[PDB]
UniProtKB/Swiss-Prot annotation:
SUPFAM superfamilies per UniProt: PSPTO4464-like
Function per UniProt: Member of a network of 50S ribosomal subunit biogenesis factors (ObgE, RluD, RsfS and DarP) which assembles along the 30S-50S interface, preventing incorrect 23S rRNA structures from forming. Promotes peptidyl transferase center (PTC) maturation. Binds pre-50S ribosomal subunits near the 23S rRNA L1 stalk, where it may mediate correct positioning of the L1 stalk.
Subunit structure: Interacts with RluD in late stage pre-50S ribosomal subunits. Interacts with ribosomal protein uL16 (rlpP), via the N-terminal loop of this protein.
Domain notes: Has several regions, N-terminal loop (residues 1-25), a central domain (residues 26-105), joined by linker (residues 105-116) to the C-terminal domain (residues 117-183). The C-terminal domain is not required for function, while the N-terminal loop is; shortening the linker decreases assembly.
GO biological process, one term: assembly of large subunit precursor of preribosome
Family of the protein in this entry: Belongs to the DarP family.
Protein name (record): Dual-action ribosomal maturation protein DarP
InterPro entries: DarP (IPR006839), DarP_sf (IPR023153)
Mutant lacking the gene: phenotype: Slow growth at 16 degrees Celsius, accumulates a pre-50S ribosomal assembly particle, although some mature 50S subunits are formed. Ribosomal proteins uL16, bL33, bL35 and bL36 are missing while 23S rRNA helices H38, the L1 stalk and H89 (part of the peptidyl transferase center) are incorrectly positioned.
Gene3D superfamilies in UniProt: PSPTO4464-like domains
Region (Not required for functional ribosome assembly): 86-158
Record lineage: Bacteria, Pseudomonadati, Pseudomonadota, Gammaproteobacteria, Enterobacterales
Native source species: Escherichia coli (strain K12)
Length: 158
RNA sequence: CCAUAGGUUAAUGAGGCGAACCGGGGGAACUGAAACAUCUAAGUACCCCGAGGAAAAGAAAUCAACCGAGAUUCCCCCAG
RNA sequence: UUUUGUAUAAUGGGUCAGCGACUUAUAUUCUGUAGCAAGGUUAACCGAAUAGGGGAGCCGAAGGGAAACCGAGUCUUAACUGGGCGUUAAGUUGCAGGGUAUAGACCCGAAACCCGGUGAUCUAGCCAUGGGCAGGUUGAAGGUUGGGUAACACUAACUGGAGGACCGAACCGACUAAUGUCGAAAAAUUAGCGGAUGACUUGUGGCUGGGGGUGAAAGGCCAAUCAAACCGGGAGAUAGCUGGUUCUCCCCGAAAGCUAUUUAGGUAGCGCCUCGUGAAUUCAUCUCCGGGGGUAGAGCACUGUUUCGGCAAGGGUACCAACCCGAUGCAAACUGCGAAUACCGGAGAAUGUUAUCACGGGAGACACACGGCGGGUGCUAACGUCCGUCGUGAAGAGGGAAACAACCCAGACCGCCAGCUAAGGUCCCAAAGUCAUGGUUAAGUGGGAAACGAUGUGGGAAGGCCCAGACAGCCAGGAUGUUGGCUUAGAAGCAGCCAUCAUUUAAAGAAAGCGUAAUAGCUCACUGGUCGAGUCGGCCUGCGCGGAAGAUGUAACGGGGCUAAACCAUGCACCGAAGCUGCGGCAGCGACGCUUAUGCGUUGUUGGGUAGGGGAGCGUUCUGUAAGCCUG
RNA sequence: GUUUAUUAAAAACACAGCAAAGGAGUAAUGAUGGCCAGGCUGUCUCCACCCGAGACUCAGUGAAAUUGAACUCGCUGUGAAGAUGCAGUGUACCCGCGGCAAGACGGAAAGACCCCGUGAACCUUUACUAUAGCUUGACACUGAACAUUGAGCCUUGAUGUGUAGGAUAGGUGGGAGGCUUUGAAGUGUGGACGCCAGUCUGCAUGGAGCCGACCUUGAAAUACCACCCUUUAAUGUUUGAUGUUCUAACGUUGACCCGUAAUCCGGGUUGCGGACAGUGUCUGGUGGGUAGUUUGACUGGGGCGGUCUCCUCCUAAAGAGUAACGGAGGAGCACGAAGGUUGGCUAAUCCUGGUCGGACAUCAGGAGGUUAGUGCAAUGGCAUAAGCCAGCUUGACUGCGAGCGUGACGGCGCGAGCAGGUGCGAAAGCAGGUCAUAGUGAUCCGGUGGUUCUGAAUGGAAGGGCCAUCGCUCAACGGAUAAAAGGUACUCCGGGGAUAACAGGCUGAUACCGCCCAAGAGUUCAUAUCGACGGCGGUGUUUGGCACCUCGAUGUCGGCUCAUCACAUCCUGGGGCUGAAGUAGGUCCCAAGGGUAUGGCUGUUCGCCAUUUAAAGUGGUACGCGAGCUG
RNA sequence: UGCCUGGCGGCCGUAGCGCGGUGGUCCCACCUGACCCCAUGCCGAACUCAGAAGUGAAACGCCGUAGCGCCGAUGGUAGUGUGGGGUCUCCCCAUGCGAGAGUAGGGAACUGCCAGGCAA
């Protein structure tokens, strides 16, 4: 016995995967192991829009009902993992910058712990300049300099 | 150094108010779709600028079709 | 008003007077009317102008197809014996009206969103200036004088006056109780109560302004309004929602059903309602005829289900048991059978204002309730819920059931101080039989209630014993071992193992009750005599009694009261409605004899009515008629 | 110390401490949580009296909520279901004054509770949609010198044998005269490619002659050239990524001077950075921080649970149709054959005999006429067989299709027959799918193939139109978006008793009580007292079933005050039986005149505990009584 | 015209089964061989081809037999439409229709066209 609710949920997951692969760019489609017919359907869906595009996506999901999805799911998982890693690194850099702007020496300690090679004097000078910019409504030159310095430190560490 | 900026004096003009109309710069929501996001409402509501008695536009780098009309503006058809 | 439903104790109204609700424009469809007619008609504009020009333009006469294109033909097809759309019917422009679509579009009512401005004299915080904190206490740091150390530490005496210190006034606050809730006060008064030198309080003047301000942080305060202030505009936002929709009369007159819905309290199509046109003895009741059922009933051939017995595969042969066989049952999901109704079609007399169908305009409604019948469900309980048919209410008053929509009789045109009748009634309330005949009842049954019980009473069929004398009564008998063996404690007939013998016999049992440790004793089955005629036990039942106790007051005939004024059978009379008939009066519908834009010498019938549809009218302001008429 | 101005002052909050311009086990403390002890008393048994203001009478002034109208009694039953107005019955002279409040479902607020609205408003997020902000890279402000290096256009030079061979020749080609002392053939030798087959040149002795089709070849000879692919190299060119230096852009809220009695600003010098930073467009990413929305319906109130489309049977009451969150089962296929024709054949279940083999394999005979089979759950039908086998085939075809069934409609199904061309069979004849009933998705949008149908001047083309076909568990399956989850007790708005919770009203499964039969218990004996197995009744004293009144407001558990009524009687009173010697009791009948507790635990009803009485009764009255009282 | 047979039908259990008797003059059946036509998922089994030697055994046709199967009244009863009544989870009254089962009884067929043989 198979529950209609489970079948509907599986269909929804298949349609979501189809929409994701359609959204993905040319390089992603090339990397993913998609057959010729599926690639043609994806290209047609990308070319078309509107209800026609959604029903082409539904056709893709119906085809995926029969065709295996494990390699496609693995490729999507790897791509999303890489993207999430990059996004998390960017978010952590932004958090470092924000805490440096707000607190000061407390964030300098964390920055030094994360990257011993970081220059404490330069970080303090940049933080003081950023505070002066905040007070005097000056452009975020110091904030962007701190962001670039953190990016360079992260790249050197990696 | 020159010179400029700045300063002093003389002459002309504006400074604000006024109901609506005109052009321009901004500019919504309610509501309809029996829901609602495109859309509509709407370039309407409302704010600002300027002149006038009207204003704006105005003499095609336009139409038309290879037949032909020769600025702009306004009214009725073409036309739901 | 809403409801299946309201006197409901569901909603609104204190009353009077005035004001208040389907209007307006633009296009479309239809109806009536008016001119023209295969033509009709003009917009803007001109116009000494409601005239006349202005044919720009719009509608139809020709449609088919997507189109090319064809043409009273055209699309499909390679094409039609074909099939889909047109031909044989006249449209147009106004006037008025019924709808349709947009404008706030029948009227009042939201919370809510955006735009532009006003608020920190209340209050939250902050900034600058000043003011206030009666009085009395605790009393550290520190300093001086001694004891005590190499120096320390520690300790006693004097000065000292720091504490978000203590008690307690002003001041701040509101923790408790009472009063005040249409109070003196839109958070107040009395006595207590905490702080009362600070993070305290306060006067004055400013700053922080609405998705914002402030907030020792409660979603608290921001001018008595704050989970997004106040004021003007979008804006008459929207409201599938609640309420209202105002003069009269005549005719007709439903539903709460099926399909679909982000769809259930709304909406779209159909059935149902109304108006008009056109159509066939069209439709309806019934007699007959040709029809198919699997329902009621019946049965178990089949499908299940159920009881007994046999052979019994197989399983563990005193033991479980398949498939089958014989008999007995049940089925909405069984029919070897099978109705009554109902439905279809045809023929036929009669009646019904065509009561039938097609089209067009307008609808309304799409919450149904109750009772009977056959059910599903629930508990064959529910004023419970869901089905199919009928009936009433909704939308129908009237008479009876005391009162009570859904029970019974019966469909109100109007008036009459006329008669008849249906249901129900005829002792009084209260109109009619204290009517007659033949029976039942002793119970207030009638006038609530079951399982069961009973010499209640009436009758039917019978049955047993009966003047060779029955049943019950009356002076009589009921003696002997059987103190029994047996479980010896005593059971002896009165506790049980046990037989359940035998003589006198007109006659009696080795034993039924009361009473003793058992005894004993008193009775009874049966047997003598008189009286003596009927007596005894069961079935069917009509009408009666118990089972039968509730709460404001008899309260389970309506009451009085009734022994017939209670129940069954029959009959004759009467009361009994808005039902029928009798008289007169009004209006619609169809006909014929005639009037022919209308009377009818007529004729038959109809006239309850909600939502709703059609038709006909009354009233008021203004305008022409109207410088006419009435009028000090 | 502060906190919800305006009833919540706390362990909560806060604190010292500890870890674009511009919170020091703890002394003390506490209107703090809990326990114990003493005093005190009107909190209470139980309340009595007195003092002042009202309340009462008189004189003067003088509102309010509410109001359909009232000539406005109780009881019984009915009724939209609790009657001042209905039917019956009893009672009551008319009209005032001081009180209580049981009611008039009494006044208050278009219920805050529950439901609905394809309602609103905030808050949350890995709901949808976006975006402020942040940010990546490219382009411009943005330059100059240098050190390399990836690559393109070329300029310039070699290099490149399947087999044929003087030859480590790839393609056409102006095709056939040039090279000549612009120091010749060949040479000591340096060097490049190198399948070791055979080309070559910076330089020179010498000194100025060598060569073209000529013989094979799918091409001929770098003799002159026009110009290139695999394979490589010197100069010049486009250049970018990266690195170093400089200033003239740009920054300077660094310093000095001036306008200037000037922390603004502008200008002049200088110092420090400097083509970095920043800004503007685009772009990748993040982004409940912000903003606009969504979160379906049936539902025995709502949520949860289950379902939303199609097929078979019943309910479905013998035409058709007919609902339930009613009772039983399936489906979103499959077959190029399991389809069409021609021909042929006919099982299940049993008995008999037979090696494995056995009850049940396969073989032969007997009964049997379908209980077999008919691909899929079931109905019906199927001997002509629609059931099974073999041969041939694609009619599972094309354009139609009269006439009907079926639904409101979209739509679905049947269908003789016309024309074309086919398959089977000699022929008559059959074939427009499957024995039939589930195996499916409207429209918009487009993809694919054909069609001059059209294609906005013409000739085309793009784009459309038509024919065929493809694309949705759009399963919420007549499918509102291509695109959406929750909380509100901070809530708000319009309504409902159309729909709940307390009560009211109907019924009585459940609950309590009474009774019929009587097995049996009771030392023998059913009925002194119980009494199983069974059955019949009364009450509305529990849980219940319905939702008929009430959501334009009926105050729902307790305690105090006040009580009233039924007896299914707790005591007192009158009796019967007894397994009643008497006191004391056990069971049942009549009897409601009277009475029928106090304290510790709870809010408690109830219940447990201790002590008394004759007892400390059961229930109805909106589970009595808040216009009477506390909460 | 009748005793017979075969084919094509109407009619379909009063029509079919169980038992006995009866037929080879014709027709029918059984039967012989299959080298050939034809066929066995193997077999002249079935079908097909050339004969009829032999026979009526089986089957087939006719008669009898009621032992079954089957048909089957009349009446009664159940049931039911209409209008009423009641001691109303059921029944009764007037009217109309009217079962099923069972019994008496019937029953072991009838009929249409043609062809062939016998006797007329």
């Amino acid at each position: 016995w198979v529950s209609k609710s489970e079948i509907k949920r599986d269909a929804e997951e298949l349609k979501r995967l189809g929409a994701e692969i359609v959204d993905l760019g040319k390089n992603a489609l090339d990397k993913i192991p998609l057959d010729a017919d599926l690639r043609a359907a994806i290209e047609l869906a990308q070319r078309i829009k509107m209800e026609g595009r959604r029903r082409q996506l539904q056709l893709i999901g119906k085809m995926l009902r029969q065709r295996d999805v494990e390699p496609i799911r693995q490729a999507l998982d790897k791509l999303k993992n890489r993207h999430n890693q990059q996004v998390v690194l960017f978010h952590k850099l932004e958090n470092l910058r924000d805490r440096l702007i707000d607190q000061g020496d407390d964030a300098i300690a964390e920055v030094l712990n994360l990257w011993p090679d970081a220059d404490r004097q330069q970080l303090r000078t940049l933080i003081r300049n950023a505070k002066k910019e905040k007070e005097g409504n000056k452009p975020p030159k110091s904030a962007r300099q701190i962001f670039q310095y953190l990016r360079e430190l992260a790249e050197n560490e990696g």
